[model samples]
Target: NPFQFYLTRVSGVKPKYNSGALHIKDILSPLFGTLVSSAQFNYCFDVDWLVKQYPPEFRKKPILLVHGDKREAKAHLHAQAKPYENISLCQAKLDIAFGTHHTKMMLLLYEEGLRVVIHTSNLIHADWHQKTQGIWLSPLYPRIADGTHKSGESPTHFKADLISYLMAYNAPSLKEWIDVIHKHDLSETNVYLIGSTPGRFQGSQKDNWGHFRLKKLLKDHASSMPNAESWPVVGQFSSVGSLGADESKWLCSEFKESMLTLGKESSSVPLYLIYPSVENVRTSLEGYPAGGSLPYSIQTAEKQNWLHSYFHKWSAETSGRSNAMPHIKTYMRPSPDFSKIAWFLVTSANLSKAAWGALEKNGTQLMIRSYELGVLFLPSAFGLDSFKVKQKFFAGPMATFPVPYDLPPELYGSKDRPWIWNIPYVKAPDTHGNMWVP
Candidate 1:
């Protein structure tokens, strides 16, 4: 599929609104049943939760790779899930001092072919229970029948890039899955992969991860749009990081540069940020607790106070998950009339120095933390092209991207403030009749 939203758990929602939404069960099952081999990569996971969702047609154990340095946690989890002997656990290497294993995706080996899925959902129940999440599933790539077993690369380089990202792990456990992937024919894939592996990189290496990778890919494949400034970039996420005292140091400068709108007579290309306000959370389905996942700490928010000016409310009326408290992170540029979309991305990368790298060593080296993964969709790829106007609805049937929030987001009222999780709010009790004590 091109781009789709994860179906919300709310009973009030209708199928028409969900459109082409995905479910975790769908991810676990095959075309007809659940007899398959798969590899899962994610930050937070619940083994029993996953097994419960899977249809009971298993035999070969599934492989799971999670974050952290200590294998005790890995072995502990492995032991916990070992009663059924349904899965094999592998701890992902977090070599960088500050990095965490934050990637989310899966590689499933089916009878017909192989499918690679990249998404924004954790394996835990709550992440997919009510909150909005992003996911992209590759077409089942049939295995090559011929004797040729070339391991070089593909013209699109998605295959090569994915293999390289897997190679960063350098683990014996991953070799099985890597070899399985290399043998598949994935030439039908349209969307490009934009993965962020942890480390300090420079020169040719710099353009392969984090913001540098995004910039290079955009420049190479995506054509410059007409009156590009009108198609301003928009970023929506569940959390914020310590951006330091200076905005231009990373957020406003390097990160902004990566999302550059290309055009002649290029004026200032605007950037819009969509996040939940304290009132937004207080009025949500889960209320105060929903803000827990939205970890934009009071300490971090205080440092970049100026960022609040570019904020927009999370009023996703179109998808019926507005008050669900988004755990998803998305970036895109909708056209001037909000009818056409230039590009859209579903990623695990939040707005942080750790997710996207910072320029260190006099701008010669790129320093990044965390193993983030994402998929970027461009107009040229899917034959959908065109603009980001602040419009009331995604009314256009043409050149549209399946964005979660409505176009032209509602601005925060002058009295409203950004939701910082830690600050005590005594204004009013949430829908749950409880105040934020933390």
Candidate 2:
């Protein structure tokens, strides 16, 4: 009975495996067995990871964000607003709970309806559903999934708002994030990039070699999840010090060739770049930009053009709508419950191997570990107040914190994944046949 009551009411229990009676370890039991036979233990990230292994029904999709360019980048990625899912989840809950499902855009209608019914019906009670136990309320605020204010205002506001949230909840425990790195390596790590250029792509390609190396190293350690898509553009991945001219050159070469193939006319999409804190620093040390300048930079206008070909803007009408990047922005807007994403693997490595090691800390090194803790707490599991804090920040100003509302180039109808837009044959097993560029 007490357990039932605790489940319905706020007994201070989060929704992870260890938090409540459930544990991911046990929940994923059958999954563990499958990984053994699949011979999929390459320990590398593949597109099939999200779709085949866990399947959409079980695992939660991560927020896949690509940030760097300055202007539009700030708007798309509201990093400062806080990465909690409460803002959006709660909003969706209100819609479904209040019977406002009809109002959600076509894209988000299913997600909104499903999440509400699942979270609502998932009433956890120690004794039973008899004595109303731990019931989670929707967050009060909204998260700016897309930093869509007048532009500059959105980024600044996001930073300030995020700072506020960190103060209340806490900053990303670098030590904790590192642990996760060690345990899971890059595959499980949440990546961030600093500067991007045609060379940036070269750097990424080279960095990718290191990823391959890392994958080889991790093979004997832990099996990797199968991903159906090719490696995606590293969004928030970081670089250590500086890259060599050769590595840089190779990177730029690949980028130019890819774009040429994509057609130069595809430059209509907006590009957003993020500047790093140590832009002009020597190859000795690179500090986190959250302390100084923006996180990444664009070396040329042409590079900017490359980015513009894919940046999506924030249309107030599309606020709570569906997005192209479900991994990045689930529920279209923000989710109060998102804060529950306590695990993270932050790194200073680019998608390429050279820069990551050469520039880890300032060179290239997969800061892998047993615990890499970021923020945690699902706002939907909490209440509306959690979401309110985020909304106020997104709708408000930017000053202190780092805003994280970055969106990719949002093209029309079939414009979902423009990068690999043409080579689509098979469906992404996760989105129930949703075609993503990977």
Candidate 3:
């Protein structure tokens, strides 16, 4: 990985074309310079959409597409460019085990160097057009330094973890690429590499990653919280996977416990889920076509109250992004009185057993079955503390701007509630019948 990568959190909704857009072309243009030699998980290749960003000379280069579904990859290429040779598609190595090459990463091999981008998005129009997504852009590593010797070791714990993740792929197809990554000075990077690896084991086997690792990672980094009752944690994600039903089985059971110290105050912290209403989606910048799905179902009566306390509507207070909608995933535990953020995470992982993994029968082991990764930022990482947030509306990089959600948790109102897309919506005769309400 002889690439220099810069990692920054993208805030606001619609990023500007020059500096903020998390769009692949904007981020990769500088690194690719002339042409793009890339690899990723999806073949939703829109050549015209991409070529528009590059100079005429660079538009002809073939883009290497690495995907898990062979049929879809073929269809994508055929449907778009009529079997053009300029598009190269490689089928990902698959196993009977549960996984989807779910990692949204890109490897750009340029004439000057290499660049790796790990983000939370599928290669599609909706994700970039309006829906919010997060991206981790690696610095353009310009070959190896003159005195640098080839070694698999990473300069930082974060890089080591990422290397370990790429090495987990035993497939021959990834070996050469992994070898290239091992040769770089990834130690200079500054980001937590929280990723998932498939397995079934008992008793903390193999330094388990995923949300389990996130639990341990945050405890070590977050500033000590003042002893208080009910630390409210907010979870905002586009997808929700089954996590059983009721309190014992709800994803929050394990999540809430891990968020705070296991003292008297730990159990009281309520976790909130922020998801958009169908109305919000229907009226978005690109309308319902903005493209994020609702997968969570309302299964039981008890689940309803759990839904109210935990569910909140997603809205944007940031400029130029209100209707952009959210595909980005974020988790934050604000203090009980809305004073500060205990910690924050922006990741590709969603609310599910696959991405975060499930606690095993013994309740001590985690069985994860997919490839997921994200970054966790603590107050300490940004030279701030809980008190600082109390003095200012936002802290660190967002000090002068508002975050995606309002500070105080908005309780579910009588009319407007969380949206369950599976149910059909019919408006009252007096209201507009074009959209779903509640």
Candidate 4:
């Protein structure tokens, strides 16, 4: 499978369903008898607790704590180093208050090989417990023999893009990790890395990160399906930042255009927003508590009330997380019937300008405030890559692309609206006998 849902802690779900999902412990468990080394960024990252998730031996190995935490935030995270002499912290400098090092990734090294994991979960207890999250687990990347770096398996510049993103931290201490990445045979990596480092990039550099970066990527690498114009460009995520007063501001104009890049004959790309409704949340296993993870405020939604039309219910089809409440963020262009996927991405980005970046200075430059990273899977990259040919068209009991949500997603009721977390929901109690007291 190209991607899988993070294993959920909720009940009423089957064991067979778990075969397609993974828990945090599964990712950190020892490969052989020994545990490995690791690193990642979660804004509310808990280091001590994270160490506990690993095997005893793994805890003794090097642990690199890197993020955009600074000043007071930096000091707070630093204090967590008390008991462990094996952990090293690197302060990823940032100039803004709202910006964050929210990317979730793991570069785990062991005796046999390296394992790369990128996902939507924060390294926090609550995040890993019960929610619809997604993870991209890489095939083990073993050390490359001399002169074997030129293989075609590295397909979409995965290693180089990752290294470039790492070096942006400028912490020479990361040199160890970078060198390890170099020594590994990344030929097994077939995805393209799309990262957003905080900066005001321009000209040749502008397309190096954020949505602009992805736009250019699709321009060069995306394969066009028949009448791709009618395909839906869907954006699903856990939260929303303040969009402008209307859809035309950035949502309708620029961001919509960015997700629409399918092929040269581009005519139209239908846009869809997959978010949970109040009823969906109330009936969830965790109920109202789940709404807290989805932080779209009434203020922001009121402004972009137009988004209600694009709303698709949060329906997780494959992993039984349909009612779990989503925290994963995914973008894809799929066939009208949802039977095929043109391309897909799992990122730390949300539906906000901050996470995806906002164009500035008459489009000469792009300004991104957060440290977001993701991988894009396009059909052309793998050669057989496709919903076009890979599926039964696929008559052989073949499957639809395993997107977590049900396709051609059902829309909200005529009277219902997207769940705005901060708003009052006193109408009824949730499954947990909890109502939105806030």
Candidate 5:
């Protein structure tokens, strides 16, 4: 309950770190300082100690790990367990449920869970995994029409197929594939990376980039052997280099391996790839510097298209296409079904870093570091859930950007001349009366 309280407060918990390559304070200073800084600290219990004191029912509830990035499974967490109970399917389901093909998925997941997901990122080297799948769900019980007819597929069929592929691939990484053995004891916790690959490897484009990064980190961490059930490997390599390969064979092998690993009995999980679209070029560039186009453009187009299609398919039912938010839309409020989570996080790393390894990025003249941040909630403190729900419908009629965006053009080698989106930015209405829209 305290967790819920602190999160809803305007300026509850300010994360204090010893040092960070990117100082979040720079951006939050002038903006959030006056606004959220006033929220009171409603909860001050130690997470580790509190979980222990909770009753059986509280501990038995599911764990939710909402992340913006998809880098890889955290080395800190056991290999057997994944960020969310059902990684691929959960994202797709929530996306569709939220009724937007372009929703960032992480934000949606963040709003759904009743609990808080431990979050972090991998700007440089850390253990991770890659090549996860989206499952395609089908109907087992078909309607009996005339004689006998096979059960038609459920709308979620594609999702089930995708999940099969990622799990079947069984790609090996720094940590053990079946490594997640940790229980919900107050004494233990695992670090989970929530960003996607393109976000993590924006400037770089090596296929096994995440894995390569893991290999380096594992070499450094190798000095200390893992204890009982500990993972010593750097990361899994489900596939060879293929960031540029055509769709045909890009993740085919890895998907197959994962399907085999899960076996036939593991029919529950579903998988999905990000939507691939040419428009992603402009979309990805949003909020980013302009010059870094080639890599970001193509990656955004193809990967986002793939991701978008799946989200569109899933969301076709509940929110309908017309009102659905785009997956790239960073600001979002999740629906009631998925609102069980305590908080959500957004970043750039993808499944590769969390599940496999780090990127070996081959192209990059500038030192491109990654960004990640976490938000914890005390839902009860200020009735944050209701507040967020009210804000869910508080978006602009349509997506639009403003003239003369703030990002630098040199980032994409176009510093001499800025290439900007013609559409003017529209400020969203604030339900909390916080003066948040700009």
Candidate 6:
């Protein structure tokens, strides 16, 4: 069977889905036959919606609601769920200051052993029902034999990175959880362990995870494809957050330079930031409110002239799904020839110092404020030689990978420019009259 897109307007020929929720339901049906064991960052999940998919026999331990922060928030979530003794709710403790348990992942214990789902969306109704999101589903991992390890199926550093991420949360709360995960063999999975741990890394030598580690990984692993340095790198995301005072200090610059070595050619290549425009929101299925927590300020936009000039609209039309506001965060560096993607990443992280991590003086230290994860796809993963590809319609080995948007991204129309990421204060412009307001 061919690969499927999560949200598609067309019917039949597979990938036909009424809503995003249904798509997830079907994808997980094979593993989560009765009980659904999962973890979530937000407490506003529609448990009832998921419960209805299975029979009553397998619905004993419905879910494990993992959360953090305010007591009232936890209480509020408890009140929302239907009473059941097996429905476990737990909290994660972070010693690192100003950190949040923002990781979105699910671990299911099935007959096949374990199934993991990592995606870029909250467990809320609107996020699944209306907004655009991306998910990475793992194959069923069977239990490993005693005193014997699984074959070398994973990357050389995949297991090490995963264990390191789990060990970051040294609390007893996560110890048992980590122990359970350790038993499962992840050698068969093709994924990059991109995550964040809260800590004030003191030196450049420290393995500060998240984007800091991501840069190091790219530098160490990224293959120098043909014209890879000359092509524009685009980051299409849902939200933007505090990126320090200086525009040059923004994480966007780090992303741009990380893919290729620093030089005159690297500096010349453009980096576009694609976000949902006010017009895109206003015309969406649910209007302005559907954007979730997408906040960017006009002042910041003005201050960061490069960001403003490079900001582009999220094109739902190109995705073949209309009226859906994008929440999916994707970073893609297209081949200079525009026929293929040099590299791509689908992640839950937004454009924030907390999510991507913060760099200190001369990159001496890195600071992280949240638990985030993502998957990176490179041509080498599919046995494609990125370093020696021609400028043709997918001259690379993995030609089946889909390009979600057009070759040359469409520019902002006359109606709206860049969408400002600011919280609502004054009235947002209505459809009848007035244009997009920051």
Best by TM-score: 4
Residue 54 deviation, candidate 4, in Å?
Answer: 0.2
Off by over 4 Å in 5: 1-270, 275-347, 351-355, 358-438
In candidate 4, position 286 carries an lDDT of: 81
Residue 156, model 4: lDDT of 81
RMSD of model 6 against the true structure: 4.8
lDDT of 3 by residue, 258-311 (tens): 655322222666778887765666666655444335544545323545544566
Show how many residue pairs clash in every candidate, following the order shown.
6, 158, 12, 3, 135, 3
Error of 3 at 124 (Å): 1.2
Point out the higher-scoring one by TM-score: 4 or 6: 4
Q: Which stretches of candidate 1 lie over 4 Å from their true place?
A: 1-12, 32-34, 69-76, 149-155, 261-267, 383-399
Over 4 Å off in model 6, which ranges? 1-22, 30-36, 41-55, 94-98, 151-153, 202-205, 261-266, 297-306, 387-399, 421-438
Ranking by lDDT: 4, 1, 6, 3, 2, 5
Estimated TM-score per prediction?
0.91, 0.21, 0.79, 0.92, 0.23, 0.82
lDDT per residue, candidate 6, 1-438, as tens digits? Answer: 011223322232124234333355564565454333544444246656655534555666546666665578767767766466666666666566666777767666665577667676666556666666776766666667778765424763555566677677665645555655677777776557677767767655455476666666665556664555577777888777756555567654664556443122336776677877776776666666654456667665665555555668776444544457777787777666655566667777887777777767687777777777777765565565442222221112334554454456556776665556454424555333433333
Q: Residue 129 in candidate 3 has what lDDT?
A: 56
- Quick one: ranking by TM-score, best first? 4, 1, 6, 3, 5, 2
Question: In lDDT terms, how accurate is model 3?
Answer: 0.58
Tens digits of lDDT, candidate 1, 197-299: 8889988898899888888877876778657767777899888888777767777788888887443222377778899999999998788888888888877
What are the per-residue Cα lDDT tens digits for candidate 5 across 1-438? 111111100121122211111221221223212211110000011223322322433332333322222225232222323332422211211111111111111111111111112122111111011101111111111122445433322222322222232232233420121121111111111111221122233434322223333222223222221121121101111111223233323232332222112111212222222221222222221222111221223333344333222221111111111111122111111222322222222212232222332323443311112222222122222333322322121122121211010111011111211111222223322222222111
Better of 3 and 5 by lDDT: 3
* Ten contiguous residues minimizing lDDT sum, candidate 1: 387-396
What tens digits encode model 4's per-residue C-alpha lDDT throughout 1-438? 443324434445666556546778778877522446777656677887888888876778988877777779788888887678988877776775578887888878888888788888888777777787778888788777777654424868888888888887777767788888888878778778999888888988888899888888888887666677788888988888887877788887888888888655543568888888888899987889988888888877887777788888888664567777888899988788776777888888998888888889997888888889888878777564464323311012232345666667788889777888887888899987877977
Predicted structure with the largest lDDT when compared to the true one: 4
**Cα lDDT listed for each candidate:** 0.76, 0.21, 0.58, 0.77, 0.21, 0.60
